[PDB]
């Protein structure tokens, strides 16, 4: 009776392909009678609300549990008291005594001392959530954060109005964990679990202790580490019999670097491959590269499980080119904008839909206006229904520079939509068959990409034939049966 | 029934020609049955004391009222309470409890905690005024400022011992206004009028609201803006029928600049000339310059009203050269010192009297010592009786670089004293007739100025003849009747 | 009936030759029926413990008293109260109320608020001593320092966690002195003697007042200033009849300087020589140099009194080279390490013993490892029995660059151990007779020093003959009778 634990720093709604990956892998293992659950190492007051959201959308399976370090201690504390922390509420109440109130917006109000004139507090009410900012010498010193009129967290601020210390309160209002935050970089330093009256060097120390308490040291206990930052938390555990795996979801080479350097985190995972049960990469291509560059052997290729949903009823006849991604520098949407310009200047009709949000969103938006493509290129924002958006596209495009495998492309192919993409490390090459199910463009060759988009976007028969062969190819190469078989081989060694 | 409101940031005793200008214009309009009053936008605890002073000296007419934004709210607050703010005094009292006192000077005493040794407060008593500086962690945190044993203001200090917040107390000790001060530049940010429980973006916001409440939106209501910084406070009012005028009291070109740049504030006043009832300049010369440089028409020349006092009984026979001015860089007293040196080296007898105070005072004082003119050039300090000092001079001199009109020169001419001055923008050219009532020296030609001073300071008949024709010329050109006529034309349009 | 007062900033255990010098001079004067006592100007909680230590070791004579500025005021305060400062202890007690404790090491524990989670205090217990660090907004604000469960000092900290203010408590727990400390340089600013409710500009001001109160203005009262920094404290006293002497214990030229510059402090002592009773130097050599460089006459040569202890029973036959010094840059142990390398490369047998501690200790330790002399050169750490260590050496060496006289060398010679040293300013030249009782090596000539060490360390007869003539020479030149005679001549003038 095996039981899996998938480590990631945090879970959220706007999240990329790594979380999509974990959720699908969780579903697939639960279907194989192995409970795969997620472990997180961050504080979030509204975690319950988030899980409810992720499960409603169908993104997260209902079966999958989410174990969290703070919640484990909040639980310990909840059960230690019976009466409410009335004292803390009186403490906050007392601070706002002889006060006059000045209104700003709706929820927003500032409180001044009736007798002295001193600025006392700032309160921002928002239905469920409320925030109280207390002041000393006209500078903010603390912030009491509430959810459903109950205090959950307290942050202390420095002279630069930056957090330097946090306190977390249980369901009864009692402090269970408090921790120093480095104001400069925002790094979590000394953690103090108040409930068990024990101190920790930092989150790594705390989470190692957590994992050692959460996971049984059985050979039937499996730790999978998806988050690269989370790796040392798994690596440093005293677990002698428990299985330890590390999954590398990205190109291990340092992004935008010609010096032949590697990503710091990934390098550490790769170097220590032999000291654990195995390091997993998505493409056989990346496996070879890693083996040829490093003196390790424990590297295995296991692709992502593919959710083979049913393909749309009809193909999109209208000239619509799609792109569903995290809006980041490596996805090179700037080059997609430059390709779009070449396309529209040869054919006015074609429309480009760019779903997603991120860092580069504003620069690309500004880039659209200057190039005068406001009527041709639209930033449709983050979707929660990618499958639905895919119906509306004639073809999908990828300007992405670096990739681990590229699920967005796989997803498009599954929903009978051909992909036009730059042949990069790693993934496009693996699933795309140039002039059969899609186009594999030479990396950075924006002019040739633009031409092969015009070719496909005007020929409705090709767009239909390519999209069909694309779905066929994914079902073939990425069979859920064969992928699970690869995992199970590792688990039984 | 017209009523005028003259806007200036503040009123004080040491003040220059702009305040002298406003007071005289106030007297002149009151004599024309139009009440002209002054509006100020700054906090001063002792304002009443200052007005009493200005009215005693005869500088300010007894009829003229001074409306002030803070006093308007202090008034509102005064009337809101009946009992004294005994609580605030107990708050200050309590802070100095188990304290020992150490003496420094007379009024000066420091207070230490008897039980702990902590530095508690610094108190400086001075007959009517008292200041209490409170400390936290051996650093000053607040200053309670008192007048006649009653607290009027409280300042909060940062880590750099700079004011970052102010609170103002009424006649009963209750806080009415509190405001954030930018510690770096000393700029007034968020103003909170505690009495009316309303917040304002800053002093501009607060004063716009004030003016809208103070001034009736009648066509018989007139706003004159003398202070260039005060301009936006007048400009931004919702007043649809009230008349809006801007007076430019200085050379609109940027001081000490060869790039052809303009004074920031003046540029804004000038540019928006057409959007208001009119922008007023003192010289017809400046009017032309402004019209030839900017695309506006609403520029009018109205000189200052001249107080034609009676001229002294006798002329000064003794070799005494005078100068009455704000001691600033534009008045170029450094060049006067260099001229004085040329004069004394040709004639030992001549004495130079330099009344006034300001920025450059110390540098000029140091400059006198090094040039060895300690026995010939004397810095007589600020006078409150310029008319009296003028009796003692044979002639008056002006090294001033930039000028709006130059009243000090006009004043000298009225009191039968010829003026030797650099022909500059703007004013000397207008009233001085070279070799008739004075000398108009080529700007910066210190050698020729020195020569024309020696000429006049040795010839007692010329100094007498010039001074006589000078008084005649001012009575002629600057008739109070004609000036008031110009104003009244604008008001009735 | 003469009475002497020897000024030095502080007394401690690890201390160099200046304190050794003062103690011996104290013993010698007490033997001459003149009580010579030490005056100190620093705060130390454990001073009594230190004196007990110095007197047990026999370093300090039992007769010699140590007058201290803080102790004088602590005494004043002790006698002002009868009941204990129970209030202060309640104040500290109250601060640690609703607190939970977290353990770090043994003594080390941190305290958190049970109701709020705020970090309250840090306590480090150590048998007699205890330190309590209080916090505000997760930053340290104060430190209560205790000895035998009684609070003696309180330090206040800034935002940079640096001391900016100190408070000292008497034997009853009452504050007697409080003072501002410049956080940047650690300089003592405004001193407030709380007991006498009087303020002082700084320690200089306070100590001048102290000395004026401690020392009677009699011609039979003598002030000797050994500490160069302490000089102004003696110089600024209103004493009209009391005798004032300044002793210069070092080379007056600025260390590591080719510009011909002088030590700032020493320069001031030397320049003001004529304004006091006399400036004392140790070598007749330095006297001449000072007289030839400065326009003063009041410079006198008086050597240190030499403690002529009995020489060891037998000479060291084994190849052991010794060095007893403060480990500082001027002692140039880096060159001794370079000499040791030359010696060991010619003779493997020889061992080097380097007693003492200081600045350069770590660099020299690192230097030993790299040169591969870990088996030949050993850093034996600070000794409290130099006489005992001297028995174990065949010869002693000096690489010292700058010196006043160099007692460590004299000490070695007294205990029949020849000295191999660089001929420098000042001292080696005076007592060493090259090729008679030791070797005088040309300064920096490491190769020749190494050769003359090998010569002496292999010839057991020479090492014996030199060491014998060395003891003879010190007894001869540095007779306690003649030295005391020089002092007494100054005192009776
Ligand atoms: O508007 C949306 C909605 C969802 N996703 C999902 O995010 C994943 C992105 O996968 P990819 O392989 O491209 O990796 P990543 O963007 O994390 O680098 C896919 O499953 C998308 O469906 C997205 O990026 N944008
Ligand atoms: O010692 C004194 C006393 C009064 N004033 C008055 O300040 C005004 C200065 O006028 P000016 O035209 O020179 O303009 P400003 O100095 O403000 O630039 C005159 O009315 C002076 O009488 C002065 O400057 N110095
Ligand atoms: O391990 C030890 C023990 C004691 N001392 C003593 O410190 C003095 C140093 O004297 P020196 O003349 O060399 O002057 P300084 O080191 O103060 O410059 C001598 O009396 C030593 O016995 C030392 O330096 N090291």
Per CATH, the class of the largest domain in chain A reads: Alpha Beta
Bound molecules: uridine-5'-diphosphate
By CATH's scheme, which homologous superfamily of the largest domain in chain A applies? Glycogen Phosphorylase B
Query: What does the largest sheet of chain A look like?
Result: 10 strands, antiparallel
Structural class of chain A: alpha/beta
Identify the biggest protein-protein contact and residues per side.
A-B, 18 and 25 residues
- What is the beta-strand fraction of chain A? 25-35%
Helical residues, percent of chain A: 25-40%
Tell me, what's the shape of chain A?
Answer: globular
> What's the total count of β strands of chain A?
23
User: From the structure provided, what is the oligomeric state, counting identical versus distinct chains?
Assistant: homotrimer
Number of helical segments of chain A? 16
Q: What does the radius of gyration of chain A come to? A: 26 Å
């Amino acid at each position: 009776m095996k039981k899996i634990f998938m480590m990631v720093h945090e879970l959220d709604v706007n999240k990329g392909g790594m979380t999509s990956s974990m959720f699908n892998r969780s579903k697939e293992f639960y279907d194989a009678d192995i409970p795969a659950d997620i472990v997180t190492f961050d504080y979030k007051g509204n975690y319950d609300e988030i899980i409810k959201a992720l499960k409603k959308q169908g993104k997260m399976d209902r079966r999958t549990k989410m174990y969290n370090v703070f919640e484990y201690f909040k639980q310990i504390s909840n059960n230690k008291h019976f009466k409410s922390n009335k004292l803390l509420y009186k403490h906050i109440s007392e601070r706002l005594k002889n006060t006059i109130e000045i209104e700003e917006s709706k929820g927003i109000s500032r409180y001044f001392d009736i007798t002295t004139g001193t600025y006392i507090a700032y309160i921002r009410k928002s239905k469920s959530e409320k925030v109280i900012d207390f002041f000393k010498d006209n500078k903010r010193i603390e912030r009491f954060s509430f959810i459903d009129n109950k205090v959950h967290m307290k942050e202390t601020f420095n002279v630069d109005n930056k957090v330097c210390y946090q306190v977390f309160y249980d369901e009864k209002g009692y402090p269970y964990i408090s921790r120093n935050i480095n104001a400069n970089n925002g790094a979590v330093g000394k953690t103090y679990v108040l409930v068990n009256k024990k101190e920790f060097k930092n989150n790594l120390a705390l989470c190692v202790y957590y994992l050692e308490k959460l996971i049984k040291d059985s050979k039937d206990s499996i730790m999978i580490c998806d988050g690269p930052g989370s790796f040392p938390k798994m690596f440093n555990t005293n677990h002698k019999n428990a299985q330890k795996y590390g999954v590398i979801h990205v190109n291990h080479h340092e992004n935008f670097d010609d010096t032949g350097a590697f990503k710091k985190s990934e390098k550490y995972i790769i170097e220590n491959a032999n000291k654990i049960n195995g390091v997993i990469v998505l493409t056989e291509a990346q496996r070879l590269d890693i083996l040829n560059q490093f003196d390790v052997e424990n590297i295995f290729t296991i692709s992502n499980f593919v959710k083979i949903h049913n393909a749309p009823k009809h193909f999109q006849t209208e000239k619509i080119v799609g792109h569903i991604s995290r809006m980041v520098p490596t996805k090179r949407i700037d080059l997609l904008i430059e390709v779009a310009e070449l396309v529209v200047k040869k054919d006015n009709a074609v429309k480009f839909h760019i779903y997603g949000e991120g860092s580069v969103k504003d620069k690309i938006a500004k880039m659209i206006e200057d190039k005068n493509l406001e009527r041709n290129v639209f930033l449709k924002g983050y979707t929660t229904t990618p499958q639905k958006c895919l119906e509306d596209f004639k073809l999908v495009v990828s300007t992405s520079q670096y990739e681990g495998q590229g699920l967005s492309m796989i997803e498009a192919m599954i929903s009978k939509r051909p992909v036009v993409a730059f042949d990069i490390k790693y993934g496009p090459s693996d699933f795309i068959e140039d002039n059969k199910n899609g186009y594999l463009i030479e990396n950075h060759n924006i002019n040739d990409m633009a031409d092969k988009i015009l070719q496909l976007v005007n020929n409705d028969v090709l767009a239909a034939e390519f999209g069909s062969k694309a779905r066929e190819n994914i079902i073939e190469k990425y069979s859920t049966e064969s992928i699970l078989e690869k995992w199970l081989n590792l688990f039984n060694s």
